[PDB]
Each structure stands twice: as structure tokens, then as C-alpha cells.
């Protein structure tokens, strides 16, 4: 009996931030995707490249689980070929993506009276990200041609802003936990299924 760690990426006490997402490399395990349906209500389960039916004759060399926490209005940005603040400065997906996303509402855990400022996102990067790039650097962003030296003002901005989640917002501005699974078939012969 060798189960696969699908409760250490789905049942964690606290997730990461959007700009500093966690990547976990699953290998050497027996993948039981049925337990993924243990939650049952899913805000989104659209799956790209493969079939949701999970044909049993499918073996993969490696699996990557990327986890973070966004708003409800930004879930549609986690898809191949989109644009916005999350798919340009925080988390980018390749156009040839193989794998899929799972999002679910998390208002009872990540919302606090007075605000929850533990979740941050990036704004003003000056350049779009490339697929699967993290970029956790924090430096003052200049928009004009006047140098900025450690002072945030007029045309000098801080790139990181907080969500400040509160209860009683509404589905659009309410916490949503997202985990994306990617499947890799490396050139080496497959022995892990």
C-alpha cells in the first residue's frame, strides 16, 4: 500500500501568495485522482489537453502541483492565452499547457474581521512574465525618467499590494484557493505511474 501525497497540497493549513507560489514535485507514487473529488463543490474544474475521465492507461514521469490564493474575479485568468494582472505579472501558463486547474471558495478560512493582509500580489512589473517564472524581487518601480532612490512617491511605486480579505464582500471579491496540476513525460523511460 503506497498512496500518493494529495492531502499535503490540497489540505494545507495555509497556502502561498500569488507572486511566490509553491511548486511541489510529485514522483514515485500511485495517482488516485478520485480523492480529488472529496471536496465535491468546485468553482472550476475545466481541464485542458486531457480528458476528465482519466483513462486508466495513463502513466506520467512527473507531476507538478502549483498552489496559491487569488480572488474570484481572477480565476478565469488562470488559463492558456489570457491577460490581466495575474497572467502577466504573477503566474503565466504556456500556450501548449498539458494538465489542468482546480479552484474552490475558501471564505471560511482566509477571511477575518478587520482584514487579512497575509496575501499579496504584484502590480507594475514593467514586463510580462515567461511561462513558469516566479520573480519574487521587491524593488521600487519607476514610470517616468526621473530616478527613484529608496523613496516611494509621485512616479515611484511599490510593486506589491495586499488583498486585505474581509468577510461580507461577495463572490467576486472573495477568497478562492487554486491548485494547478501539470503532467510531464520526460525523455527517460517511464517506470512511475
Amino acid at each position: 500500500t503506497n498512496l500518493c501525497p494529495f492531502d499535503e497540497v490540497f489540505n494545507a493549513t495555509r497556502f502561498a501568495s500569488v507572486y511566490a507560489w509553491n511548486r511541489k514535485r510529485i514522483s514515485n507514487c500511485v495517482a488516485d485522482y478520485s480523492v480529488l473529488y472529496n471536496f465535491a463543490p468546485f468553482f472550476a474544474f475545466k481541464c485542458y489537453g486531457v480528458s476528465p475521465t482519466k483513462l486508466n492507461d495513463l502513466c506520467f514521469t512527473n507531476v507538478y502541483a502549483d498552489s496559491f490564493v487569488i480572488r474570484g474575479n481572477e480565476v478565469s485568468q488562470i488559463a492558456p492565452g489570457q491577460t490581466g494582472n495575474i497572467a502577466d505579472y504573477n503566474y503565466k501558463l504556456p500556450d501548449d499547457f498539458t494538465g489542468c486547474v482546480i479552484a474552490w471558495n475558501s471564505n471560511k478560512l482566509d477571511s477575518k474581521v478587520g482584514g487579512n493582509y497575509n496575501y499579496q500580489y504584484r502590480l507594475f512589473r514593467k514586463s510580462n512574465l515567461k511561462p513558469f517564472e516566479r520573480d519574487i524581487s521587491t524593488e521600487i518601480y519607476q514610470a517616468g525618467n526621473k530616478p527613484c532612490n529608496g523613496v516611494a512617491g509621485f512616479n515611484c511605486y511599490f510593486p506589491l499590494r495586499s488583498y486585505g480579505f474581509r468577510p461580507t464582500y461577495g463572490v467576486g471579491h472573495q477568497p478562492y484557493r487554486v491548485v494547478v496540476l501539470s503532467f510531464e513525460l520526460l525523455h527517460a523511460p517511464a517506470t512511475v505511474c
Partner: protein
């Protein structure tokens, strides 16, 4: 650059403004529903923080040229942040203004009058004098409450209003405006294209042109009402005279809807006031707000959110905490919509459930616009959305589908006259009052009236425009206009004038869109999804377009048109003409309660 530095400046302003303006509304909500000495302090602190942020961000934005190098929407957003609001005042002047406003609000809210027989028995304005002035029929009972209200709080409100006017005129002078009235009239300015233009000084000539074709219709209604009141009060009524102030159905005379029982045309026919049916069938405050949601869904508009049923008040909380019962619709931000209202089981509180839910639907529609463009296209557009819903909800046949009228109810000419007279008692009866009050405030703010002639000019304009006499004369110490809630709380009052024209223009447009053939006062746009998208396309615009273009999108016009209003009351104009065949239409200003 400029245009490329403006987008990054607004993207930084927006996310700070949406977060720093949400906790100032959540403090006002917590104060208005709890009322203590801590919630008031929290509200003051949050308001101070939000004002400081805005005053810092408004002077920074006044360095972006704007000659002509930009896109339209960015230009509209930047031309709205360059106003500075009321921050032009210094610290001392701002503190004085806040102190005066708070004092006036507290005095008005806590104002009470005590029974002369029992000094320990005192009644407030809301559960006290309002019921007497809305349901009593005795001359002495109605006069006493009126006199006491005008003699206790109104006389106390006089000294503060002088400094209030002085400071708010100075702040308007600082903001490149002649006076504060012109500041209030600056909401009607549009600049988005050629032909779609307007000027804030054109408002006064149009608001006067429109109040020329309407007064002939109002005079016959006044004649009929005074003819009925003469039978009601044979002694204190003169046929060649003006109506007494306290005998108008309310404390001021805003709505004559409470005069329907006295002046009902045909008593034998079933009543249009379905209060008794609501009471008997077992209707609570939740059913009133559930039958007013099935109306918006049928016409093709979204459901109410789930944070509206669990967060709204919708009924007086009883318990021990004090609440403000003035109906209000709150848009706290971040998708939070609420309604505060002390609902009771009456027809008047039933239609009011459609007016305030019509603000939430309008707020829910332009929530996709940027932060600075989330407002009604005009200050009179926002109050004209609930009214067109209340017009359809009040028809005699819409009350049969929901069961408030018998299944064998028969509709004929008598029912038409009943319905039209009841509707005109509320809509026509408020227009002269609104126009006169706003005109008086405009004349005072522009400094065309001396400080020693306020009340004398007030009661002199009343009996030349409105037609209401005063029972007892008032000296220069008396401050009568300060009695009104809007006057003492710094609110504009001209919205309720253009509202009553935009109302009928929108109603006729929606009736034509719904493919309805017949009279206008029997529209009932319910169960029509093709008249719910024609409005929604206009509601979902906000300030992103000039109000002239927004009006043209729906009614095909670029200005106010009073012809749609006249078709609504056409069957009532005639009957009033024949019913006044041998009556002297008009009032006498020279008449006075005292001799000579």
C-alpha cells in the same frame, strides 16, 4: 509621455481608494444601526483618513496638462479627480463646518416636543408627530404639533445656518464658482461630443420653462382639494384663499397622499389602498421584499446577492439600541449592497420597497466601471429609476396577480379616476413645493436676499408659487426652512424635480419597447424581458458618457420633455375641468387669517 504616466497613476490611485473608502462606509453603517459614543468616533476617524487621502491625491493630479493629449475615458476620470471637493477650506474652516453640521444633525435627530399636560411625556419626530400629522383630522391637534415643531427646533437652528451658508459660499468661491448654488447646479454639465453639450447655467431657464405648462393642471387639483377641505373644515377655510400649512397631509406638505380618504372620488368602488388586505392576509416585512424581487427578475434583471439578505436591516431591531429609520440604500464597495429601512405593513411602505431596491439594481449595474466613474449619469437619473418601477407596481391590475385585490374585481372609469387621483396626489402635489424650496435656497446662496427678510420672502413666495397660507405669522427669529431633513443635512433638492420628468420619459419609452397598446397609466412592464435590457444598457454606463447621450440612448432626446408627463394625467385633466365648472380657480395672496 503624460498619457502613459496617467494610466499607472490611476492604477495606483484606484486600489488605494477602493480599500480606504470601504472602511469609512462600514463605520457609518455600524454607527447608523447601533448609535453610541465609540462608533461615532470611529466614523469620524475613518472619514478624516479618507478625506486626507483624497486631498493629497487631488493636488497631485493637478499637474497633468490635459490640453488635448489623451483618450476619452482617461480624460473623464482625470477631470473628476481635479475638483479637490471641499478640501479647499483651511483646517479651522473645515473644523467649524464639521462641528456645525454635526450639531445640526444631532439637534434634528434628538428633537422632541413634550405634552403640555404631562411634562414627562415627550414625543420624537418619527414615532410621534409624524403619525399625528399623517392620520389626524382635528384642526387644533394638527396646528399644535406644527407650531411646536416650528418653535422648538427651528428656532434653535437659526444661528448655525448663517455660518453654514457663509463657509460653504466661501469654499465655493475658492473652487472657481460664484456661489454654492452654482456649485450644486454644476452637476448638469456635459462635454463629450458636438451637440452633446450643456452648460450649468442653462438649468434655471429650463427648470422654469418646464414649470409653465404644468401649473394649469395643478390649479384644478388645488381647487378640487380645497373644495373637499371646505366640507372637511367649514370654519377655518376660505374658498377665495390659500390652504393652511398644517392641513396638507404631512408635517411640511411634501406629499398629499394622505388626503386620499378625504377626497376619494367614489367610495363604493374597492379601495386602491390595499393596506387592510396586506394586514389581513398575513404579510410581514420579508414578504414585502420578496414580492419586490420577483418583479425585477421577471423584467430581466439580476437576483439580489446573498450578502443582501443576511446583512440588511429591513426591520427595526427592537432590543435596546437606537437606529435611524430613514430609508437608505448602501453601496459599501467590494460587492457589498445593503438596504436600511424600518419596514411596516402598509401600502406606503410597500411601494417604498421598490424605490430603494431600484437604487441597488442601478448600483449593481455600473459596478464594472473604474472607481471614479461609478456614479449615476446625473443627480436626477438616480432617483428616477425606482419611481418607474413604483409606477408599474401600483397599477390596479398588478395588484390582482399578487392577490391583493379580489379575483372578481371589475375595472372601469371610476377605478381609473380613483387611481389617477391617487397618483396625482403624490406626483403633481410635490412639484411646486420642490421647485419653490430649491428656488429659495438658490436665491439665498446667491446673496439676493437680506438676512432680515428671509421668512417674509419665504411666506411671500409660498402664496404666489405654491399656494399655502401660514396660520400664525413668524418673526425674524423663526427659522422655518431648517425644519426639513434635507435642508438641515446639506442635501440637494432639485433631483426630485428633474426626477419627475425623467420618470415619465423613461416610462413611455419602456412601454413602447414592451409593445403595449393603450393608455400610459396602465403600462405594467412586468413579465417583459425586452423592456429590461433597454434600461440596463443605460444603467450600466455610469459617468462614462454624457447624460445627454445616455438619455438619447433610451428616449431619443437630448433634453427634458414634459409632453410624456401630460399624457399620463390626460384623463384626469378633463374630469377636473368639468368638476370645476362653477368654481373660482386660483388663490388670493391678499387674504390673511387676521383682519386688514
Amino acid at each position: 509621455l503624460t498619457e502613459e504616466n496617467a494610466k499607472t497613476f490611476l492604477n495606483n490611485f484606484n486600489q488605494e481608494a477602493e480599500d480606504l473608502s470601504y472602511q469609512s462606509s462600514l463605520a457609518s453603517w455600524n454607527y447608523n444601526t447601533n448609535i453610541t459614543e465609540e462608533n461615532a468616533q470611529k466614523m469620524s476617524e475613518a472619514a478624516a483618513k479618507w478625506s486626507a487621502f483624497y486631498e493629497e491625491q487631488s493636488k497631485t493630479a493637478q499637474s497633468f496638462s490635459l490640453q488635448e493629449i489623451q483618450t476619452p475615458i482617461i480624460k473623464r476620470q482625470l477631470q473628476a479627480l481635479q475638483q479637490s471637493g471641499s478640501s479647499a477650506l483651511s483646517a479651522d474652516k473645515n473644523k467649524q463646518l464639521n462641528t456645525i453640521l454635526n450639531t445640526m444633525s444631532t439637534i434634528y435627530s434628538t428633537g422632541k416636543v413634550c405634552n403640555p399636560k404631562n411634562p414627562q411625556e415627550c414625543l420624537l419626530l418619527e414615532p410621534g408627530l409624524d403619525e399625528i400629522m399623517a392620520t389626524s383630522t382635528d384642526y387644533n391637534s394638527r396646528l399644535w404639533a406644527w407650531e411646536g415643531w416650528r418653535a422648538e427646533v427651528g428656532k434653535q437652528l437659526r444661528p448655525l445656518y448663517e455660518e453654514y451658508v457663509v463657509l460653504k459660499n466661501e469654499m465655493a468661491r475658492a473652487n472657481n464658482y460664484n456661489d454654492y448654488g452654482d456649485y450644486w447646479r454644476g452637476d448638469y454639465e456635459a462635454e463629450g461630443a458636438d451637440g452633446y453639450n450643456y452648460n450649468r447655467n442653462q438649468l434655471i431657464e429650463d427648470v422654469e420653462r418646464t414649470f409653465a405648462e404644468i401649473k394649469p393642471l395643478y390649479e384644478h387639483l388645488h381647487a378640487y382639494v380645497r373644495r373637499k377641505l371646505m366640507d372637511t373644515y367649514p370654519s377655518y377655510i376660505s374658498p377665495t384663499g390659500c390652504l393652511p400649512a398644517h392641513l396638507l397631509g404631512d408635517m411640511w406638505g411634501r406629499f398629499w397622499t394622505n388626503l386620499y380618504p378625504l377626497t376619494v372620488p367614489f367610495a363604493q368602488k374597492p379601495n386602491i389602498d390595499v393596506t387592510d388586505a396586506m394586514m389581513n392576509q398575513g404579510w410581514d416585512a420579508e414578504r414585502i421584499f420578496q414580492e419586490a424581487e420577483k418583479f425585477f427578475v421577471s423584467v430581466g434583471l439580476p437576483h439580489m446577492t446573498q450578502g443582501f439578505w443576511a446583512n440588511s436591516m429591513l426591520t427595526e431591531p427592537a432590543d435596546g439600541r437606537k437606529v435611524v429609520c430613514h430609508p437608505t440604500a448602501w453601496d459599501l464597495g467590494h460587492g457589498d449592497f445593503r438596504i436600511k429601512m424600518c419596514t411596516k405593513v402598509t401600502m406606503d411602505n410597500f411601494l417604498t420597497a421598490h424605490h430603494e431596491m431600484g437604487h441597488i439594481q442601478y448600483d449593481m449595474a455600473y459596478a464594472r466601471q473604474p472607481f471614479l466613474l461609478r456614479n449615476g449619469a446625473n443627480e436626477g437619473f438616480h432617483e428616477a429609476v425606482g419611481e418607474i418601477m413604483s409606477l408599474s407596481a401600483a397599477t390596479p391590475k398588478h395588484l390582482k396577480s399578487i392577490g391583493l385585490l379580489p379575483s372578481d374585481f371589475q375595472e372601469d372609469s371610476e377605478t381609473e379616476i380613483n387611481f389617477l387621483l391617487k397618483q396625482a396626489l403624490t406626483i403633481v402635489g410635490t412639484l411646486p413645493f420642490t421647485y419653490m424650496l430649491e428656488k429659495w435656497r438658490w436665491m439665498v446662496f446667491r446673496g439676493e436676499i437680506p438676512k432680515e427678510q428671509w421668512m417674509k420672502k419665504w411666506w411671500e413666495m409660498k402664496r404666489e408659487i405654491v399656494g399655502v397660507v401660514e396660520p400664525l405669522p413668524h418673526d425674524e427669529t423663526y427659522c422655518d426652512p431648517a425644519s426639513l431633513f434635507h435642508v438641515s443635512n446639506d442635501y440637494s433638492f432639485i433631483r426630485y424635480y428633474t426626477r419627475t420628468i425623467y420618470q415619465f420619459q423613461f416610462q413611455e419609452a419602456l412601454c413602447q419597447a414592451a409593445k403595449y397598446n393603450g393608455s400610459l397609466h396602465k403600462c405594467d412592464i412586468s413579465n417583459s424581458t425586452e423592456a429590461g435590457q433597454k434600461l440596463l444598457k443605460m444603467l450600466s454606463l455610469g459617468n462614462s458618457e454624457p447624460w445627454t447621450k445616455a438619455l438619447e440612448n433610451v428616449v431619443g432626446a437630448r433634453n427634458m420633455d414634459v409632453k410624456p408627463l401630460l399624457n399620463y394625467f390626460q384623463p384626469l385633466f378633463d374630469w377636473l375641468k368639468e368638476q370645476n365648472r362653477n368654481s373660482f380657480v386660483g388663490w388670493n395672496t391678499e387674504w390673511s387669517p387676521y383682519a386688514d
